[PDB]
């Protein structure tokens, strides 16, 4: 599953049967453990 963003160390605890973790909006947030946080963006 391709995507773009900044990898980050993850303090959350997964389970052996769990690979992915999706927060609200059903978007990829944490993936086997590393956190996915998109790089900074905004308006100008």
């Amino acid at each position: 599953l391709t995507g773009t963003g900044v990898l980050t160390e993850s303090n959350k605890k997964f389970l052996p049967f769990q690979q992915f973790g999706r927060d609200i909006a059903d978007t990829t947030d944490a993936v086997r453990i590393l956190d996915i946080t998109p790089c900074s963006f905004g308006g100008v």
Binding site: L1, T2, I24, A25, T27
Partner: protein
């Protein structure tokens, strides 16, 4: 729940935003709701027709959200115009309008800040502890009809006094606080009483 209006406005805005966020992840008839997955598993022609379906759906959702936001903005603008009118009339002065600045006779108002609004503390005058009295439209004295300048003629029992409308402050009927207009033959309900001449 004493600030139900502000909380309701915040809840409606949050619900609309959350609804838009949820609609971001709808299939809209496509093979997947994730655009990146579609691009990484399809031939450019079919990929772009699925992209067209997703674009149509998300654009429709955004159109709906913007329309609801505009309607809510108009409603909030009307409420703010009313609040500005209340600030100008109830806070910056005394308003004779009934129930515009609180129930009862308005005295003053105080503004207080709220997270997304304003609070008006309306100080008002409320009559209480009422008593029964006998009235007469005018007093026939010396063949002349006397009407009160300001107030009303009243009489617990027999003694006739003149008081003010909003408070019971009886005063002796006198030529200073009464004015004469014609005789006592055309007034309906006129009574006979003495008028003190100082």
């Amino acid at each position: 729940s004493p600030l139900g209006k502000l909380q309701d406005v915040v809840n409606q805005n949050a619900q609309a935003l959350n609804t838009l966020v949820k609609q971001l992840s709808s299939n809209f008839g496509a093979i997947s709701s994730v655009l990146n997955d579609i691009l990484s598993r399809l031939d450019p022609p079919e990929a772009e027709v699925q992209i067209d379906r997703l674009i149509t759906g998300r654009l429709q959702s955004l159109q709906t959200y913007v329309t609801q936001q505009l309607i809510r903005a108009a409603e909030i603008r009307a409420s703010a115009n009313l609040a500005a009118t209340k600030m100008s009339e109830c806070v910056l002065g005394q308003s004779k309008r009934v129930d515009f600045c609180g129930k009862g006779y308005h005295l003053m108002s105080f503004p207080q800040s709220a997270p997304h609004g304003v609070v008006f503390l309306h100080v008002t005058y409320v009559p209480a502890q009422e008593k029964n009295f006998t009235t007469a439209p005018a007093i026939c004295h010396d063949g002349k009809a006397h009407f009160p300048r300001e107030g009303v003629f009243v009489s617990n029992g027999t003694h006739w006094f003149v008081t003010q409308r909003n408070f019971y402050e009886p005063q002796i009927i006198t030529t200073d606080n009464t004015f004469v207009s014609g005789n006592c033959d055309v007034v309906i309900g006129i009574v006979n009483n003495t008028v003190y001449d100082p």
